């Protein structure tokens, strides 16, 4: 009956509709691991082919997060400048959080192109430190057994942050943020999951991880430009031109 219970339902629905793979499918595929031969095949690929593959997967992941944001109550009513400020700053942070679902803490593997593989699958990219950081981050969230609704509500808060520099209608973003904060806290209380609050990553950790990741993608894009499937001209302009 409350606006808050409806907000939880709407955020979770927006999330279910914008999540590429179902949790059940990711969990059943846990036993489907790349063989020693398949790993070698990925390791032998050119860094530039691995870059193209990864850039396609990441672009697609970002577009689903943009669709997720568009479905958040009041996001569409924000001015274009603020929608772009929030997505530029937060869309990749949401992508990085969403990765924990495809991460298996038991063998330190991630679901990539149909099977589970370790960080050694990405050797040709020559990004070992960055990839270890992404794996470590996914591990910290996966150890919490972060539920589907916890991911939906937490990633809505990653996006709707009134502290992002450059916002023009801060008060409008704050209104949306307070309601989502209440929705998250109300949901954790009901499910007896408030204990994860002290275990979540410090905000600065996600920001720094995302800045390092985006900086690396920008270096690859400068050296070897990809043909990007662009759906959002104002957002594309901010990241690529
Ligand atoms: C959604 C999109 C469009 O369809 O118009 C525009 C922006 C994208 C994006 N890319 N991106 C990347 O990091 C990225 C990606 Cl996802 C792939 C290749 C290159 C890059 C980049 F920007 F670094 F050059 C973002 C980071 C934060 C917010 C972002 F929105 C992005 C992807 C496509």
DSSP 33-69: B--HHHHHHHHHS-HHHHHHHHHHHHHHHHHHHHHHH
CA 235 to ligand 1: nearest atom:
6
Question: Cα 114 from chain centroid?
Answer: 19
* CB distance 30 to 36 below 8 Å: no
Give the DSSP letter string of 149-218: HHHHHHHHHHH--TTSTT-S-HHHHHHHHHHHHHHHHHHHHHTT-GGGGGTSPPHHHHHHHHHHHHHHHH
For residue 116, the surrounding DSSP H or E stretch is: strand 115-117
Handedness of CA 124, 125, 127, 131 (dihedral sign): negative
Would you state the torsion angle of the CA atoms of residues 169, 206, 184, 191, taken in this order, to the nearest 10 degrees?
A: 180
* CATH number of the CATH domain containing 61: 1.10.565.10
Q: How far is the CA of 9 from the centre of ligand 1 (A)?
A: 28
Question: Cα 53 from chain centroid?
Answer: 17
Q: How far is the CA of 95 from the centre of ligand 1 (A)?
A: 11
Q: CB under 8 Å to 218, separation ≥6 — which residues?
A: 239
Q: Is 234 left (phi over 0), alpha (psi -120 to 50) or beta?
A: alpha
Tokens of 33: 């691991």
Q: Which residue in the block uniquely carries the two structure tokens 């949901």?
A: 187
Residue 112 phi/psi, 5° resolution? -140, 120
Tokens of 115: 């099977």
Tell me the C-alpha distance between 213 and 21, whole Å.
23
The terminus-to-terminus CA distance of the chain in angstroms comes to: 46
Tell me the C-alpha distance between 140 and 134, whole Å.
10
* CB distance 164 to 191 below 8 Å: no
91 lines ligand 1 (CB under 6 A): yes
141 lines ligand 1 (CB under 6 A): no
Q: Which of 239, 240, 241 for mutating ligand 1's site (highest number of atoms within 8 Å of CB)?
A: 239
Structural domain including 70 reads 1-241
Q: Which of 62, 68, 216, 219 for mutating ligand 1's site (highest number of atoms within 8 Å of CB)?
A: 62
Q: CB under 8 Å to 145, separation ≥6 — which residues?
A: none
Length of the chain equals 241
* CB distance 51 to 125 below 8 Å: yes
* CB distance 206 to 96 below 8 Å: yes
β-strand pairing of 103-104 with 115-117: unpaired
Domain count for the chain, please give it: 1
Q: What are the CA-CA distances from residue 193 to residues 2, 26, 134, 184, 188 (Å)?
A: 21, 23, 25, 10, 5
The experimental technique behind this entry is X-ray
Tell me the C-alpha distance between 19 and 17, whole Å.
6
Tokens of 110: 């991630």
95 lines ligand 1 (CB under 6 A): no
Tokens of 88: 């530029």
**Secondary-structure breakdown of the chain: helix, strand, coil percentages, each rounded to the nearest 5:** 70, 5, 25
Closest by CA to 74, choosing from 82, 85, 63, is 82
Angle of helix 170-190 versus helix 148-159 axis, rounded to 10: 160
Resolution (angstroms) stands at: 1.8
Q: Is 83 left (phi over 0), alpha (psi -120 to 50) or beta?
A: alpha
Q: CB under 8 Å to 206, separation ≥6 — which residues?
A: 93, 96, 97, 137, 158
Handedness of CA 140, 142, 147, 149 (dihedral sign): positive
């Amino acid at each position: 009956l409350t606006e808050i219970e409806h907000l939880v339902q709407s955020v979770c629905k927006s999330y279910r509709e914008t999540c590429q793979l179902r949790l059940e499918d990711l969990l059943r595929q846990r036993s489907n691991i790349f063989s020693r031969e398949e790993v070698t095949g990925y390791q032998r690929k050119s860094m530039w082919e691995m870059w193209e593959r990864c850039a396609h997967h990441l672009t697609e992941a970002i577009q689903y997060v943009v669709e997720f944001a568009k479905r958040l109550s009041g996001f569409m009513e924000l001015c274009q400048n603020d929608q772009i400020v929030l997505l530029k700053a937060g869309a990749m942070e949401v992508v990085l959080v969403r990765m924990c679902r495809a991460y298996n803490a038991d063998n330190r593997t991630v679901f990539f192109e149909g099977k589970y593989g370790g960080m050694e699958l990405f050797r040709a990219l020559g990004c070992s430190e960055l990839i270890s950081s992404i794996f470590d981050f996914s591990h910290s969230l996966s150890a919490l057994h972060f539920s589907e609704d916890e991911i939906a509500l937490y990633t809505a808060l990653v996006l709707i942050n009134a502290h992002r520099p450059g916002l023009q209608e801060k008060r409008k973003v704050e209104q949306l943020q307070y309601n989502l904060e209440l929705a998250f806290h109300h949901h954790l209380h009901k499910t007896h999951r408030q204990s994860i609050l002290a275990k979540l990553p410090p905000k600065g950790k996600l920001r720094s991880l995302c800045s390092q990741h985006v900086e690396r993608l920008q270096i690859f894009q400068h050296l070897h430009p990809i043909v990007v499937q662009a759906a959002f001209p104002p957002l594309y302009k901010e990241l690529f031109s």
